Every structure is written in structure tokens, then in C-alpha cells.
């Protein structure tokens, strides 16, 4: 019988890895593609310095991380361990959005 961990043990393992880690978690080239796509809506023919795109990527990553830990606080507050979208709307609406 091939080896298989129980669920969550693996999850805590990459929790430890990725919370230890420092690098960006999302793929780069779709992030330039997306920022070009959405900046296309406001003004035409925009050119992007790679440093600006990286700074946007880090800001987005930190904003999402803060949102996710707030939803963690909300989820453990509701005596559950699995997050649901109303945690996200709650966290944003308490935050002021």
C-alpha cells in the first residue's frame, strides 16, 4: 500500500515552507499579462517597467495575505476550520470596504 499522509499534515508542511519562504507565490508572466489587460481599460498603449510590476505584485501579495489571516481569525472565531466566502466579505467589511 503506497504511502499517503492524512490531510492537513501536508497542508501544515507547506504552511511552514511558504511562511518560511520569501519568494513570490504567483506566476510572473500572467501577472504582467493581467496588469496590461486591466490598465488597457483606463488608457491605451501603456508600457510597464518590470520593477513597477514587481512592486505591484508584492503589494497585491501582502494585501491578500493580510486578508487571508483576517479570514483565518474570522473562521477560528466561528469555531470552524474551513474558510467560506462570507469570511472574506466579513473581513473586508470590518476593514472598511
Amino acid at each position: 500500500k503506497p504511502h499517503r499522509y492524512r490531510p492537513g499534515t501536508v497542508a501544515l508542511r507547506e504552511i511552514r515552507r511558504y511562511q518560511k519562504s520569501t519568494e513570490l507565490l504567483i506566476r510572473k508572466l500572467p501577472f504582467q499579462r493581467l496588469v496590461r489587460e486591466i490598465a488597457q481599460d483606463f488608457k491605451t498603449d501603456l508600457r510597464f517597467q518590470s520593477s513597477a510590476v514587481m512592486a505591484l505584485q508584492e503589494a497585491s501579495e501582502a494585501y491578500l495575505v493580510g486578508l487571508f489571516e483576517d479570514t483565518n481569525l474570522a473562521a477560528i472565531h466561528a469555531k470552524r476550520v474551513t474558510i467560506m466566502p462570507k469570511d472574506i466579505q466579513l473581513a473586508r467589511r470590518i476593514r472598511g470596504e
Partner: protein, 109 residues
Amino acid sequence: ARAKAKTRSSRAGLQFPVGRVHRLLRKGNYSERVGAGAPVYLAAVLEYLTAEILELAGNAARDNKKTRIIPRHLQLAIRNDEELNKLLGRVTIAQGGVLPNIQAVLLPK
């Protein structure tokens, strides 16, 4: 004919430039006129701030057995100090990550 030019940072015994910060206040559009001791005081305040945060960063890097400071070490320095975190709750550090922080209920048993 003229006295030897002596730097004002040496007069204040400080590493941060008194003249540059003084010029920055003069072109920073904060007041029409600036007192002489105010940039000296500000440079001393900043020098203490950078001194303590660099001490924390060096201690954190020595914990990581690295002789050169890393943005990860800087994030560890900011978030593991409550008082600097209260200073800097709204800041984002590039490639800094976050603290190792797992909620107790998330652990097994």
C-alpha cells in the same frame, strides 16, 4: 584667510548629514524658515532609529548564520518588535514574508 571647513554632522557627532537633511527641509515646503537645531535633532532621531533597527537586523541575521542582512531578516525585525510594529503596522516590505505564526487550533490533537 578662511577657517577650515568643518562638517556639522561632526559637530553633532552624528553619521547622518545635517546639511543634506537641512536642505531637504528647506525644499520640503514644510515651513518658510527652519531653526538651526531642528535638522540636527531630526538627524539624531533618525540615527537612533536606524541604529536600533540595524542592531535588530544584525542579531536576526546572526540567528540565521548570515553575515549580510536580508529583507526576510528585516520583516522578522519589524514584526517581532511590538513597538516598531505599532510604528509600522501599515507598511509592506518587499520579499519579506511574514512571521511563522500558526493558530493553536490548527495544530493536531
